[PDB]
Every structure is written in C-alpha cells, then in structure tokens.
Design a protein around this ligand. Structure first.
Ligand SMILES: [K+]
Ligand SMILES: [Mg+2]
Ligand SMILES: [Mg+2]
Ligand SMILES: [Mg+2]
Ligand SMILES: [Mg+2]
Ligand SMILES: [Mg+2]
Ligand SMILES: [Mg+2]
Ligand SMILES: [Mg+2]
Ligand SMILES: [Mg+2]
Ligand SMILES: [Mg+2]
Ligand SMILES: [Mg+2]
Lengths: 52, 288, 151, 95, 54
RNA sequence: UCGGAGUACAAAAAACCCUCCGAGUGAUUUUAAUCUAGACAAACCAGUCAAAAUAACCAUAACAUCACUUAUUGAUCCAAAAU
C-alpha cells in the first residue's frame, strides 16, 4: 500500500495551495482547511497529483 | 607659551647626528635567527603547515563549506542599480549657516553645499543627490531657498515654517558629475549638456505637488503648502511680501544645469568669456 | 530667461506667472478650523527614552469655534480630561519631534469634535470588561430590589 | 580567494558570499536558514516558521566572510526605501 | 467622587494608573548567534531614526 | 545513517569488527493558523520547546491521535510546476 501526495486549492477563489498525503485507493479528497488570505474556514478540494 | 624653547638654548644644536623616532612608533622586526626563532621559524612540524600548502580560505576539509550550504537569496540583487541619496540633517544645515559655510542671502543648491564642505557626492557610487531629513526640525530657525533631490514631510514643514522654499529636482549621473564638480568640467572644453528627464520610476515623485517637485504644476503648490501648515499648526507666512522674494522665487529650467547658464554654452575660463552657438540646429538641439 | 519645451510655462499654460505658486487662497478653505492662536501650547521635554511632551489646553466653555450642541457633548463624553477650572487637556507622547506631537494633538482634537458634532454619531461596542461590568451591575441590583422606609 | 590578481594586482572577492549574505555596517552578517524551501509538507508549523526567519552569524563566520570579500561591500550605503536601513548601526551596546 | 474633591475637599482630583514592570531582556552580545533579525529591535531606545554627523 | 536498554549503578557527556532490540512508515480525523517574550541543545550546519498578542470555531475555543512514540529521514547548486 502506497500513499499519494496531492495539492489542494481553495474554493474561495484566492490562490492558496497546501499539500496533503492521501492513500492511493481512496477517492478524491475534500477537506475543510483554514486559509489566512480570507481569515475564514473554506472548502478545499483535490486539484493535482505531485508526488507518490 | 612654549617653555620648552627655553631648554633648547642650553642643549646643543639639533642636527642629523642626534635624531630619534617617537618611542613605540617602530616595532622591531623579528628574523628567524637564533635558538628562539630557529629550527622551525614559527611554522610547525610537518603537514601542510610547515610546507605551506594548506587549502584555500573557507575550505573545511572535504565537508561542504559554510558559505556553500546556505541557500541563495537576493540581498544584493541589483544593488549596483539602486539609487542612493546622501542624507542632510537640519542640525547640520543650521550648523553650516551659523559658521558662514553657506549663506541664505544667495540661493542654496547642491553646488553650494559641496563648496561649503557640507556633503560629499560620489556620482560613480550611484548617488543621485542629497535627501533632506528632519533630524533637527525643532531648532531650525533659518530662512533659505534650498533645492535638493529628495525631501521628507517634516523637513519641508520645518523650512516652510520660517518662510523658506523647498524644491526637489532630478539629476542624471552625467549631469550630477558636472554639477558637483563644475570647475573640472569647465576645463574639459565641452559644451554644457541638457539635463536628462527622470526615468519612469521617478516620474510620480517629481510630478506630485506633495513632494514640491520641480516638474509639478505650480498652481497646486499654494494649496499643498497650506495643508502642511494646517497639519502641523503653524501660520503660513506670506512669502510674496518679503524683500527677498526675487531670490526665493529663482528656479532652473528642467533642461538647465546651473543658474543663468544655458546648454550649448562653452565657458572659456582662461579668457573669462562665454561662448554661444549660432546654428539653428545647434540651438534647437540644446533647447529641446 | 532660458526657456525649453519642458519649461513650466510651456507644460502648464494655464498658470504662467512666477507669483502664482506663492499665492494664499483663503477663500478656498474658509472654515478656519482649530484657531491655534487661542490654544495654549506647552512643551515639556523628558531626556534620559527621549520624548517631548506637547499638551494643548484651552477653555471649553469659551471656545466659540464649536457649536453649542457640540460644546456640551464634549463635556459629557470627555469629562475625564476636563480640569477643575474647565480647561480641557490633551497630551501626546508618540514622537520625539515636537512638531509631530503637536500635529497628533490637533488631529486627535479634530476627531473629538468631528464625532461629537454629528448628532447621529452614537457608536456602541461590546468588550470583555463590559460583560463583567454588566454582571457586577446586575448583581448589585439584586440586593437593591427591597423597598422599605429609609432614614 | 585571490589575494593578488594578475591584471591590476588588487584583492579580488568571492561572488558566492555576496549572492547569499547581507552585511550590515555594524559588522553583523545576515543569512537565511538552510532548508527553507525543501519538503515543507513534511515539517511542522513551528519548524517551517523557524526556517523562514533571518539569522545572524557568529564571530568566526563573520570574521571569515570579511576576509573573503573586498572593501567595496563594507561601505556605508544610503538606499532609498531600504528595509534594513534602520538596522545598519548598533545602539545601547555595553561591552 | 469628582465633586467631593472639588466642591467639598477643595482638592485637585488625583488620577492613578496600573503600571506593570518593564519586560526583561538579556545582556546584549556584540555578535548574536542564530538570532532573528528582530534581535536588534528589543534593545532599540526609540523608533525615530537618529542621524549623527549627517 | 537515525532511535531505545545495558556497558555509562546517583547532573550531563563518554568508546570498541562490544552485548541485545528496532526505524528508511502505516491507520484514523480532532486537517493541526499568523505573530512574538524567554530558554534547552550545539564546533558549524542543523534540531527542539514557548507565555503574551491576533484570527478561527463552545462566540473571552491551538498539544492531531494510536502502534515501547523515541527513529520513520537528505545541504547547496540545479531542474520542473502557478508565482
Ligand atoms: K623555535
Ligand atoms: Mg614574527
Ligand atoms: Mg620579515
Ligand atoms: Mg639546528
Ligand atoms: Mg622536520
Ligand atoms: Mg603530522
Ligand atoms: Mg565526500
Ligand atoms: Mg559617499
Ligand atoms: Mg547550553
Ligand atoms: Mg496563548
Ligand atoms: Mg556546489
């Protein structure tokens, strides 16, 4: 079992990306992070795969 | 006064036979001769010490050096193109006037400051003039018409309180070298060239009336001057009613370097005469 | 007498006289706020942290450059700064240069008058100390509820 | 370090030092932490903050870098809008 | 309370304030080692820049 | 190369081609912010903690947890990606 590193972009329109380690067999991940640009919790979705 | 001169009458005459250097001025040299400095001469015993083949400076013996394991960042990125301004404090400006180094009767600009040994400008080291700082704004009681290359809000307010005039002008390094050292330029036998325009980066600074820019619209100066007077709570003097209004209103054309001189003029210092061109193309080029 | 295509006369044709830049347009701003000639300005320098204390003192009752409703609202809100003799005292300690200290006092005085001048200006706020102040005030009203003949 | 050059005979400088160090007029040198751009997802929030901070160099490192650069970089510079302009001079140093 | 000092006691009202001790800092070293750039700001006397001979 | 126990009996440090265990990652969601006093550690490079303050959300909310929890990792340059 190998994990995948994916970059998540904010859904608030601001440009903010933080990488998160994810299991390969899992589907697309969607979290609730906290971007300082808007100073409020906003939805984050998986955008790109960078490292395995 | 010099009571030691009385002692010299009794002592013999001073000649080359009896002269001694000041004690301690010449430390003696140590040569590698004798038991002490001998058989090793202060080098060591074997290795790269005694044979003089130690590595370069900053090499830690195969290990990555300290100056190579630090990531590059731009601290001196483009430093050779950043503009530098020599600071002039109002404490020093007051000091120069009190000692007669400069005079407020005559208009003061960068040239008069250099001749007064107030500030030294090196055009080669990317110096674009003198900036006025507000270190001595509280004790500034002089009334001058000073022209600098950069000014602060408090420095301008302090001068305008006494009834002075502050104006900021831009000088190209080609022109600034001529301005700071006029006499050496006049000995090069070349016509006075036009002063170049500020670059696109420095246009807003010299165009706004808040900085008293030389290229600013004069109609907005009186309203900008009163804003400073209101802000700092000092009554704005009526400069037009002073007897030195003609001197205080003197300015320079943006294409002009010195007071009363024009581009294209050749100063023949030997004959104390000024030469002027006559051709239409020469006059147009030096006046456009 | 030298003129070029970049001269001020040829760049701004509307204003050409050299006396234009030194006029005094008193008519443009006739409000004449803060007539500092009637304000008592005192400077006290403390050298050791070096700062210049600049204080502005004036009589609130006789200050005729403010309206009557504004004059009394200053006393209601800023009654903590009012001296015994009715002299409103404002003090600054921010900058070392006394020019900036006096400028800060004038700007602070403008804000005091500006917010008090507007009848509709009545902002409110909630603070951490406001919560306990309300609670300690509510608690002392519990004991006050008894109503029997007093002295 | 070339103590004596073959063209003018003066003392050369090492361009590696200037590209990654800043010299304040007080003698202190400034540098970035090593590894402030590598594997950020792996490091904690506190560790990333520590690596993003400017740091000073001790006496031996400061003395070493003064013998590797010429005297042009030790001059007093008055830059316009320089963030480090206020850090040039030392103050209240009781040694 | 204010009227008591003025009308009754004929006294200028004294006003106090709660003053905390100043923050503690270590002795300043000539060459700070692995310290942030803000190390100089702790021992600064005033934020107004002070020019010397200039 | 990195961690734990003994050698190293009671502050720290302390070696061997010395004696025994491990690590070169998984599981889960509580997805873990910004800024700064003072310190441990250390040749250097690195590593660690951390009050106050600000924002987040019970509207006066910062330790991600578990597996001996301790180790689960790599400096510049350079290259690629949105910056
Ligand atoms: K010897
Ligand atoms: Mg010797
Ligand atoms: Mg010798
Ligand atoms: Mg011998
Ligand atoms: Mg031998
Ligand atoms: Mg040997
Ligand atoms: Mg090797
Ligand atoms: Mg210089
Ligand atoms: Mg220690
Ligand atoms: Mg806290
Ligand atoms: Mg290399």
């Amino acid at each position: 079992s190998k994990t995948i590193l994916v970059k998540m972009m904010s859904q608030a329109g601001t440009g903010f990306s933080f990488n998160t380690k994810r299991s390969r067999l899992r589907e697309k991940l969607t979290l609730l992070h906290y971007d300082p640009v808007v100073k409020k919790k906003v939805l984050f979705v998986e955008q790109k795969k960078i490292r395995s | 006064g010099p009571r030691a001169l009385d002692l010299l009458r009794a002592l013999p005459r001073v000649s080359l036979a009896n002269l001694k250097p000041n004690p301690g001025s010449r430390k003696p040299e140590r040569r590698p001769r004798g038991r002490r400095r001998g058989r090793k001469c202060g080098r060591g015993h074997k290795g790269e010490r005694q044979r003089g083949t130690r590595p370069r400076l900053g090499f830690e013996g195969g290990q990555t050096p300290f100056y190579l394991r630090i990531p590059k960042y731009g601290f001196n990125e483009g430093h050779s193109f950043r503009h530098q301004y020599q600071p002039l404090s109002l404490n020093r400006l007051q000091y120069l006037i009190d000692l007669g180094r400069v005079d407020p009767t005559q208009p003061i600009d960068l040239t008069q400051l250099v001749n007064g040994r107030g500030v030294t400008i090196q055009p080669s080291k990317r110096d674009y003039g003198v900036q006025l700082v507000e270190e001595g704004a509280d004790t500034f009681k002089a009334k001058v018409n000073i022209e600098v290359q950069m000014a602060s809000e408090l420095a301008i307010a302090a001068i305008e309180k006494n009834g002075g005039v502050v104006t900021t002008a831009f000088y190209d390094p080609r022109s600034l070298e001529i301005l700071c050292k006029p006499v050496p330029f006049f000995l090069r036998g070349q016509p006075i060239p036009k002063r170049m325009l500020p670059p696109e980066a420095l246009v807003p600074y010299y165009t706004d009336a808040k900085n008293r820019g030389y290229l600013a619209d004069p109609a907005r100066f009186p309203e900008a001057r009163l804003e400073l007077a209101r802000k700092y709570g000092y009554v704005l003097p009526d400069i037009t009613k002073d007897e030195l209004f003609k001197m205080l209103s003197t300015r320079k054309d943006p294409r002009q370097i010195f007071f009363g001189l024009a581009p294209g003029w050749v100063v023949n210092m030997a004959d104390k005469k000024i030469l002027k061109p006559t051709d239409e193309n020469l006059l147009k080029y030096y006046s456009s | 007498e030298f003129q070029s295509i970049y001269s001020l006369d040829k760049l701004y044709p509307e204003s050409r006289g050299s006396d234009t830049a030194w006029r005094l347009p008193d008519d443009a701003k006739q409000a004449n706020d803060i007539p500092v000639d009637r304000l008592t300005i005192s400077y006290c320098r403390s050298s050791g942290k070096v700062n210049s204390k600049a204080e502005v003192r004036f009589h609130l009752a006789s200050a005729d450059w403010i309206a009557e409703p504004v004059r009394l609202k200053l006393a209601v809100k800023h009654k903590n700064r009012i001296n015994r003799s009715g002299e409103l005292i404002l003090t600054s300690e921010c900058s070392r240069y006394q020019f900036r200290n006096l400028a800060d006092c004038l700007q602070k005085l403008r804000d005091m008058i500006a917010e008090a001048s507007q009848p509709a200006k009545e902002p409110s706020r909630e603070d951490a100390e406001l919560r306990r102040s309300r609670i300690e005030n509510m608690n002392r009203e519990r004991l006050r509820k008894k109503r029997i003949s007093s002295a | 370090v070339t103590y004596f050059s073959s063209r003018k005979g003066k003392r050369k400088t090492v361009k590696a030092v200037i590209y990654r160090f800043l010299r304040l007029h007080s003698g202190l040198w400034l540098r970035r932490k090593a590894g402030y751009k590598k594997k950020l997802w792996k490091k904690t929030a506190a560790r990333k903050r520590r690596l993003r901070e400017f740091v000073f160099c001790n006496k031996t490192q400061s003395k070493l870098l003064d013998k590797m650069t010429t005297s042009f970089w030790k001059r007093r510079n008055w830059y316009a809008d320089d963030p480090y302009q206020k850090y040039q001079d030392r103050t209240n140093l009781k040694v | 309370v204010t009227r008591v000092f003025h009308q009754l006691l004929d006294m200028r009202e004294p006003v106090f304030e709660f003053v905390r001790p100043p923050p503690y800092h270590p002795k300043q070293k000539r060459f700070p080692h692995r310290q942030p750039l803000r190390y100089l700001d702790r021992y600064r006397d005033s934020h107004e820049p002070t020019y010397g001979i200039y």
